[PDB]
Design a protein around this ligand. Sequence first.
Ligand code: HEM
Ligand code: SF4
Ligand code: SF4
Ligand code: SF4
Ligand code: FCO
Ligand code: F3S
Ligand code: F3S
Ligand code: F3S
Ligand SMILES: [Cl-]
Ligand SMILES: [Mg+2]
Ligand code: NI
Lengths: 172, 581, 296, 296, 295
Amino acid sequence: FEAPVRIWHWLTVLCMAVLMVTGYFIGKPLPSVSGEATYLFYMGYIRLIHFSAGMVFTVVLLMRIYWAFVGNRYSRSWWQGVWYEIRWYLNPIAQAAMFGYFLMSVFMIITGFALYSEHSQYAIFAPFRYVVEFFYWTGGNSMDIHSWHRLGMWLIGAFVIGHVYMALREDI
Amino acid sequence: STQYETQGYTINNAGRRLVVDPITRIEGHMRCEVNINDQNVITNAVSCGTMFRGLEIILQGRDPRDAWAFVERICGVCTGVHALASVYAIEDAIGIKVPDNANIIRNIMLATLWCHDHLVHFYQLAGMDWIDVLDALKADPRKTSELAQSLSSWPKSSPGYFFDVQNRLKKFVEGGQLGIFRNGYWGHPQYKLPPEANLMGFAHYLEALDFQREIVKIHAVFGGKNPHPNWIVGGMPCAINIDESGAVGAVNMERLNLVQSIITRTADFINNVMIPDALAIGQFNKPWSEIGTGLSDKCVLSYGAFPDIANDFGEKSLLMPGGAVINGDFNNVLPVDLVDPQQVQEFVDHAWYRYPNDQVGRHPFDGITDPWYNPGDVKGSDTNIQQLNEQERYSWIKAPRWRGNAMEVGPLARTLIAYHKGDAATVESVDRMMSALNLPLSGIQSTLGRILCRAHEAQWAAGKLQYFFDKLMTNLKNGNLATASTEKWEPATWPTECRGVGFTEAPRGALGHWAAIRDGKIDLYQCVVPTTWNASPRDPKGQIGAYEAALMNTKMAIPEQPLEILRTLHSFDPCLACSTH
Amino acid sequence: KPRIPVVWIHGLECTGCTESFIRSAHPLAKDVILSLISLDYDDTLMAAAGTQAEEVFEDIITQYNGKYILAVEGNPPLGEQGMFCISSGRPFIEKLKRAAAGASAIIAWGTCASWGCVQAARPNPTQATPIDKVITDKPIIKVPGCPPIPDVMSAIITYMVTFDRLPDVDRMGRPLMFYGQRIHDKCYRRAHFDAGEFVQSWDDDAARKGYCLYKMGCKGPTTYNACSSTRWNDGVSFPIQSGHGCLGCAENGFWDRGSFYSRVVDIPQMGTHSTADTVGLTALGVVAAAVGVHAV
Amino acid sequence: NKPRIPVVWIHGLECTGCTESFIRSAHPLAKDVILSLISLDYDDTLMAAAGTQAEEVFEDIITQYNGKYILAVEGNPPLGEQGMFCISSGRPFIEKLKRAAAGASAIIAWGTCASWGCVQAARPNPTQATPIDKVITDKPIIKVPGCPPIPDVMSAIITYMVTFDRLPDVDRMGRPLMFYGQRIHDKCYRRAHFDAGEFVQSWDDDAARKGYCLYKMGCKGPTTYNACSSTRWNDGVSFPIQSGHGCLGCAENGFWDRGSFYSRVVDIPQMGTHSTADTVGLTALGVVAAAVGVHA
Amino acid sequence: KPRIPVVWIHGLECTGCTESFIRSAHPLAKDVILSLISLDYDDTLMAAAGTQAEEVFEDIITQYNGKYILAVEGNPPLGEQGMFCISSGRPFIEKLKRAAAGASAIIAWGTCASWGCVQAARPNPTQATPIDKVITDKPIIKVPGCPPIPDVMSAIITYMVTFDRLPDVDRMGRPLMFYGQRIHDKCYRRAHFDAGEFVQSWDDDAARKGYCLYKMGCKGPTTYNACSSTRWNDGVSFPIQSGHGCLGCAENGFWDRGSFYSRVVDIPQMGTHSTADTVGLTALGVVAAAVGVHA
Ligand code: HEM
Ligand code: SF4
Ligand code: SF4
Ligand code: SF4
Ligand code: FCO
Ligand code: F3S
Ligand code: F3S
Ligand code: F3S
Ligand SMILES: [Cl-]
Ligand SMILES: [Mg+2]
Ligand code: NI
């Protein structure tokens, strides 16, 4: 068994809200506590909720993308790119927004997993270890992965401020 | 050829030219050129820094709190001293006062570096100029033992021990793989130690090579690692916990016990191995108490160091005295001010840099580091220097002057300053040393004197270590544990614009960092480093620096083998990455 | 028996890597030099200078051509035709290339030779370049760190001598044995990290109990090295243990990765001091502007 | 000169491991402790006098320096067989202990033996071995547990008491806060693996060869207070976990009877980040794979 | 057993600190003097005067050299060669240095000895200088306040006698026990501060209900001392409790920190009820005015 099609959107939103709130505090952690670190795991739980929200998010996102593809794009190699451009200068800047949004999510996954699979996951995560070499090729290290990952989160939050105001503008 | 008069010297570049490139058994990259007359005497000397990195440029725009970490990498040999200067400077600019323990620990870090740096230089750098390593193969172990035991209390002196050392060396060479000893100057007539003294020396070289690693454990406790320990603006990051839960995660009694154990061992090695060896080289190389005087009987400089009163850099606080002497007038030790635009200035008219007017010197607050490699005609091409044109630009080192005077800095300089300021401990110490050598006080102002003063400094520093440690422990007994001031850590608390100076005495002499902060970022960062002073090129007056002065009038027994040049230069303990940064 | 010939050259450097090498506790640097290898050229330690030093260099690389190990400390500058670093009146890069040509393998000591280190930081006045950007036809073992751990340096040396082979390396050319894991993967303060127990300002109660230094900017989480296990100077300590966060000194371009004291750091390809919060919050406030202007 | 503080070191039922540990001290060396910090006036293991000469020393010290000496106690008294399970000078050891404690200013209880009872007190405690604090009730007793305690911890506690002229601050159990304030598990360099859910499952597996956590091999780190993970053993060379064996819990009361050493600790929170998130991912990947029809 | 010798000297001061000391409720100053220490020199209380007093001074610092505690009230003036404060025809600073030289530790009583206090305020006519600027080679325990709390003074004394050690101190040399926290962090009026409930003028309704004195210039938020917990004169009161804001009298250079009746700066302040009352009326007025009932 499964459910209605809007479940697989409210999920992503739930995942998104969690990956943001948690990922935020992985980089700018909450105030410090004090006790006996045997019985305390606050930061560890934030990271855990993050990685596994990122698991769910990743699965849902990829199935949700697989269908839009199979179904022609949306509506029920740079040619199409250069042509998207001519008709693009005349709602055409709103599609490129929803597209950029799904492009970010995938970037947040490629980068997010490069970090997660690092300490020798040694299985199906083998490709993500090109992302690392790439950032090294850039003349950087895995710290840059963290930085670009944190940036992606802010960029997503930008669309969300737009996409939310744009939706609430459908309070006709 | 050109001919001219400066500071009592005749600078004459006629005659034969000699090139020593690379200068080895120094830090970094140096090129030296000389001219000798028909008698084989040096009539012209050229000091050339053959490297540049540009830290002053790299520090532009960065966070003042990060500065120490960048500048520390100016030099891995005098590791830590630039970081000390940097935190001094930034704390001067912002107006930060560090806790007592933080100051004591910083003094310990400096003292530790003095002990380590002096020791390694004596044996691993300068040592083979005086010790004929291959001649040690001809020594009698039993006699070597008797010599060693006549000079020191040190336990490691058995005939069997020297025999073992001699055998290890003999085996080592019998393979033709002489390594670091290959193509040396062994058998040079200036090698004056008897075979037994060479064996003793070489054994101690090995002992020093081993033991130097232990000294820096003090840096590892308080600064995490060596080379390049860690520091913070506002004090030190090594929080102290003696008597409370979690002391395992801080500097505790056990950590302090380790520090105490290193201090004892360090003073013991310096006093009974290095000191007697320095004294021994003195006994066998007395003519060198009259060679390589240079500027040391004319102009010497010290900023002073080791503030014993926290945040007080005045005369009542610095345990190592500061001051300047010019024109050989050692009877008036002049006060030094690093803010005064009239005192410290740098000239680039003979260096590979650009000024709006290269005929004037710039105080570091007005400093400019604009590098341009422009050698002029160098009897070669631009990538094939056969001879530096010492008339024009010939070095990556700036030319520092104090009130227009060329100065010598370092252990000898400091000793003279302290001596003539009437520091009782210093006076007594120096007179004893010279009395033992049956030399006048003047004998210190020489190539030999530099080496002697360095050794004496190591002994001074080792003594100081224990002093500082005791000060720390007294604070701890009194419940004074604070190691940092956090109050003005946040850039929001800083003045919008401010500037400061950080100074201390590095192993090689007077060090200064000049820093200007604007809007929480570094607007200016200029460094004048001890070897910058000593290895300085000429100025618009044609005045020569410490190295060039010291090499003047020097007799060479064989010019195809620059042993006398090496002896004098090495006596300064050149650090070229420091000089150029 | 004969020992393997080693040529140790120096480019732009602070000589910290050489200094580290002689700190080795086991084996002692003394025993390495005397018994394990033949240190045939090394400016810092050799007796010969000038033309005598040059003769040694040419003689070693010629007589032991294709058989010696080249150890490289520092890096070559490309600026001013290479004359930012001059050796025997010529650009250091020529020496490097000449030495590399006859080497059977090359050791890149420290962050300098591996990556570029401090002189290569913005704006790299001299165009300091890591060795592997210049020498592309030789096996290069990167042993990064500023400097690397003394006993790591010697362990790598003893490995190559004893096992007569190069150590296995990661995709970056670093030996897996000491650089296969991150500091954060073996840091004794991890218990505090995961508990959310952090030092917030220097010398607070948290610092006095040895709490995690993540909020003080520790770059342990992204830095591969052995410091948290092997430790420094005969296992006495390492940066974090003495209360300062890891700077990331073993990592490529760590100098230009923002403040050492901040979690969110400079993105070089995007301005002078623009970080992910800078660029990110600017974009968030710019949409809020559009979203509130249009809504009136 | 200066007199040193008189120290009387007595031995009950023990293995003499604590005395051995004491002389392992790296800083200060045991030699210097004996020479300069204290006056070790009685100690069966080291003293020249035996028999009636030893008895005379004992009597003379505790009488002359009555109320002014420190009593160090290694081992513990047996209550069984009227105390004749441990006989000193033809009398029950407990009589010696009581006589020594009556004149002491303060008592140091070396090791788990004196602190708790250790191995001889394990089920069924044939001799009724009893910790010192159960016998002596009117004197300050500083418990320095461990089997044995860390050498440098022992000397540090001694140097503390000499230098600062006072007893170290203690928990409710009498252990010095300085070294027993935290758990092994809270300063263990393998926490990263614990926290990730990366465990050794059997000896010398790939996990063990990478130095993964030993929680599932029975490590009692999570319930053991000691300094082994920070201070470390034998001049900071190693500690049990670092050399691949889990903590036995040897600093803790009755640790011998807390089940097998290879049995997992209980009531310790443990939820791995990567272990949980790997499960969450496959659970979701497998739910989808089932619905699509590419199950297995 | 003999009692620890204490030498109590006086520089430029008001004798407020000596007065405070004798206010001690527990232990009584009487019992401190008879049973806990040996107050061997103290100009205010000793019988001997002139040459007799000088003889006592010399005898104590000689006989008990290296073993006595030096208690310092007031401070030395550097102006006029030190002759702004004259003791036995000579500058007080000479007696200070002499007494310091033989002391094992120095207690700097009050703001005067610790910092400078009122005489060091602008323009410091006599160049009054705190003890730690003059004596640099001795442990100095600063016990600031004008004067310090009587029972804090005696508690510090009893600590050093009973525990035979100096109290742990901050980086400023203040005993952590009584100076580790700010007045504002233990003030019984913090509820009002946090609510935004302030006295605005003297004897208003807010003052008669014991509201916060932040707006009346209370320097509590920047002052380290124990007045809000230990309180004054056997726990009877402290400045804020009797309706006056903290002057900051335990802090360095507090006399020159602007008027006492001027608000303190860079202290975060955001009321709970003062903010929520504002958000409410902003919303209610936007609403009531739209409906039409602005009246
Ligand atoms: C909308 C998608 C996501 C958002 C908004 C998000 C947000 C964040 C943020 C802000 C950080 C902190 C970066 C820093 O300051 O260092 C972070 C860390 C991280 N994220 Fe994500 N993330 C997302 C997706 C993912 C995914 C799919 C994964 C894959 C498992 C992932 C794995 C990680 C990891 C491994 C870290 C750092 C863990 C650590 O070392 O503590 N993220 N995330
Ligand atoms: S101090 Fe650094 S390496 Fe250690 S646990 Fe914290 S972040 Fe990780
Ligand atoms: S269970 Fe043991 S091995 Fe694992 S982190 Fe805890 S103390 Fe270390
Ligand atoms: S400002 Fe003054 S009256 Fe108000 S809470 Fe703070 S200390 Fe008390
Ligand atoms: N000593 C030293 Fe290095 C130089 N010159 C510095 O500073
Ligand atoms: S700063 Fe470098 S020394 Fe190790 S702890 Fe970090 S890699
Ligand atoms: S067994 Fe004992 S030795 Fe330490 S590691 Fe556990 S407390
Ligand atoms: S005025 Fe002084 S008395 Fe206390 S309340 Fe303020 S510190
Ligand atoms: Cl030794
Ligand atoms: Mg400079
Ligand atoms: Ni240097």
